[PDB]
Structures are given as structure tokens and as C-alpha cells.
């Protein structure tokens, strides 16, 4: 599924990301835009054999188990396939654990490169929430 910008903003707000651990909603919408372009089925095989899955490109080396990555740790205690659903429940649950580490949203390279330091609020502006 490819979410519309406002559609994802409303969904993420419903999934409790409006002000989760100090991060405003715009951060999450912006992150999704640059990590997967709002596509829940997005996948990106990495060099180390790991793969980034879903709308928030969660990595198989540290967060989910896809059964094909070397030093997998499965910090989110969940199969990567669950992060490829049109239902963002699992991706949000795992993203919350990720951001709960001291590194916060810096875990998302695209967010760091294209969102951090920008007017992220713009990503939820002009939306019925």
C-alpha cells in the first residue's frame, strides 16, 4: 500500500506517534516519505546481507527476523514479514522501541539526512487529522 501524506499522518496519530518520546508527528511522516516514499511494501537489501523492511525501513540485522540475516538480534521480537503489511501496527510498535534507544530517530538515515533540522511540522500541515 502507498499511503497519501495526510492519510499516513492521520494513521500515525491514531497509532500514537503525535508526540511519542519527544518526537512530533511531522518527524514520522517525513521519515516515512524519505525512507520508503510512503510504501508499506518497500524493501531494500543491504550489503551486510540485512534488509530494510516497510514504510519505515526497519533493518533485519537489529530489529526484525527475516531468517536470512547473519548476526540478527531481532530487538523487536517480530518477523520482518509483519512489517510489510498494509496495516502499520507492527511497524509502529517496532519503531517505538527503536526510538526508545538513546539514538532516537537518528536510527533512520533518511530522516537524519532529509528531516532532522527541517520544518517537519510542514508534513502534517493541510491535513484533516
Amino acid at each position: 500500500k502507498v499511503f497519501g501524506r495526510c492519510e499516513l499522518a492521520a494513521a500515525m496519530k491514531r497509532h500514537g506517534l503525535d508526540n511519542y518520546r519527544g518526537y512530533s508527528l511531522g518527524n514520522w511522516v517525513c521519515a516515512a516519505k524519505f525512507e520508503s516514499n510512503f510504501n508499506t511494501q518497500a524493501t531494500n537489501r543491504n550489503t551486510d546481507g540485512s534488509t530494510d523492511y516497510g514504510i519505515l525501513q526497519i533493518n533485519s540485522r537489529w530489529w526484525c527476523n527475516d531468517g536470512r540475516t547473519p548476526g540478527s538480534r531481532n530487538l523487536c521480537n517480530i518477523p520482518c514479514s509483519a512489517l510489510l503489511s498494509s496495516d502499520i501496527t507492527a511497524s509502529v510498535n517496532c519503531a517505538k522501541k527503536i526510538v526508545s534507544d538513546g539514538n532516537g530517530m537518528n536510527a533512520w538515515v533518511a530522516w537524519r539526512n532529509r528531516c532532522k533540522g527541517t520544518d517537519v511540522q510542514a508534513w502534517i500541515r493541510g491535513c484533516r487529522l
Epitope: 496519530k13 491514531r14 497509532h15 500514537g16 506517534l17 503525535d18 508526540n19 511519542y20 518520546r21 519527544g22 537489529w62 538480534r73 531481532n74 530487538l75 521480537n77 510498535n93 517505538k96 522501541k97 526508545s100 534507544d101 538513546g102 539514538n103
Partner: antibody, heavy 113, light 107 residues
Framework: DVQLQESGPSLVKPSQTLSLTCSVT????????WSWIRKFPGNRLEYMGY???????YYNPSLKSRISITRDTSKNQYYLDLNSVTTEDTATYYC???????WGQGTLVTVSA | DIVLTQSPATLSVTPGNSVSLSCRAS??????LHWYQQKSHESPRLLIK???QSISGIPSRFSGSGSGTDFTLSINSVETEDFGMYFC?????????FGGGTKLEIK
């Protein structure tokens, strides 16, 4: 599967450092976030803090920075240190993973002169 | 800190009857509220995560609902094994905080 268990002294003196250990069995401590929670008399629960995969820690300001949570991979366990304890620190201490799915059995620690 | 208030403090019910437990937050916490059950001489047990998400291994009679500042834990047809303490805990902001608990007893 995973098992957690607290261990350490059940009786400590005022002003000393209270230390507890949580031994994890079934998987590596490097594969989750680890927490400490305590229950005071009167069913009052307080989240003490947790240490995440990167080593970063989050401590409840209520502890006024008297707390330290560390890990030891070789022994697959993590610890809780609480300095300058007072009778207000008497409680049942529990270790549990960040998700809340796995808990130790809890251990009562009484601070008394 | 985010303050969680639970009510009623105590609730007596006859097995077979249903009940609802309330947990209200001093400020919005989205869906970041987990429910725990705790029996004497025992550690807490997670019943519901993120306001309404089910937990594998928990009886289906337990359900949660709510968002923002108002949440409830419902038990459809209470059983004797359900008597004990119930606590809500928010994870929206650090420090995580717990409600004062609701005691469920046999009437």
C-alpha cells in the same frame, strides 16, 4: 524460551548502596532493552529505568540520580545499583524486559538500621 | 510527569459478571498505555499493549480501549482467576509512570 531472576541482599543499611542482579536465561542480553521496576507498600509501582541496546540509559528523575543500570554480556545479566538508600527505598524489586513480556519473580529488599 | 489516575480504587464483582476499569492520563499519551495484572506474591503480567492490542496467551475476555487521556480495561465475564490488582502504565513520555491500581475482588 526466556527466564529472568533477581538476586542480591534482602536486607541493607541506610546510606549504603543497594545492588541487585538480574540473570537472563534463554537469549542474550544484547538482544533486548532491560528494565527495573519496584513496588512500594500500598501497591505503588515505580518505573526505575532501563538500559537499551546501545548502552544508553533512562532513569526516573524521582531517583534523584542515585541509580545506575549496567550490563555484563559475558555473564548474560544486568544490574541495579541504588546509592545512599533510605527506608523510603524498602520495596519489592523486579527486573523485566522493556516490552513487559518477561519478568523476574521480584525480590523484597528492606532498608533498616 | 504524566499522572495516571485509576478508578475505582476497588471493585467487587461476582464471577460471571463483566467489569470495566478506568485509567485517565493528565495529558494525552496517544495509544501508549499498557495494562498489567498483578496477584499477591507475583510479578506483573502484561494483558494489553498500546491501549487495545491483544497479547498472545492472555484470555480473550480481556480487552482494552481508549486513546488520548481516557482508557479502559474490560473483562467480559470475570473468572476467579481474574481477582487481583490491575495497573495501567504509560510509555509515551519519560519517565514511564503507573496508575495507582484497581483491586478486583470477589463480591
Amino acid at each position: 524460551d526466556v527466564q529472568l531472576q533477581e538476586s542480591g541482599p534482602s536486607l541493607v543499611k541506610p546510606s549504603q548502596t543497594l545492588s541487585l542482579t538480574c540473570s537472563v536465561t534463554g537469549d542474550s542480553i544484547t538482544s533486548d532493552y532491560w528494565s527495573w521496576i519496584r513496588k512500594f507498600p500500598g501497591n505503588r509501582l515505580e518505573y526505575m529505568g532501563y538500559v537499551s541496546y546501545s548502552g544508553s540509559t533512562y532513569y526516573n528523575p524521582s531517583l534523584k540520580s542515585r541509580i545506575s543500570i549496567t550490563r555484563d554480556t559475558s555473564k548474560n545479566q544486568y544490574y541495579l545499583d541504588l546509592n545512599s538508600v533510605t527506608t523510603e527505598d524498602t520495596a519489592t524489586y523486579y527486573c523485566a524486559n522493556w516490552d513487559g513480556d518477561y519478568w523476574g519473580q521480584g525480590t523484597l529488599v528492606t532498608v533498616s538500621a | 510527569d504524566i499522572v495516571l489516575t485509576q478508578s475505582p480504587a476497588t471493585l467487587s464483582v461476582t464471577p460471571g459478571n463483566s467489569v470495566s476499569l478506568s485509567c485517565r492520563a493528565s495529558q494525552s499519551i496517544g495509544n501508549n498505555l499498557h495494562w498489567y495484572q498483578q496477584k499477591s506474591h507475583e510479578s506483573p503480567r502484561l494483558l494489553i499493549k498500546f491501549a487495545s492490542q491483544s497479547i498472545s496467551g492472555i484470555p480473550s475476555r480481556f480487552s482494552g480501549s481508549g486513546s488520548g487521556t481516557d482508557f479502559t480495561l474490560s473483562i467480559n465475564s470475570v473468572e476467579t482467576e481474574d481477582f487481583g490488582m490491575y495497573f495501567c502504565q504509560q510509555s509515551n513520555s519519560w519517565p514511564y509512570t503507573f496508575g495507582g491500581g484497581t483491586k478486583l475482588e470477589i463480591k
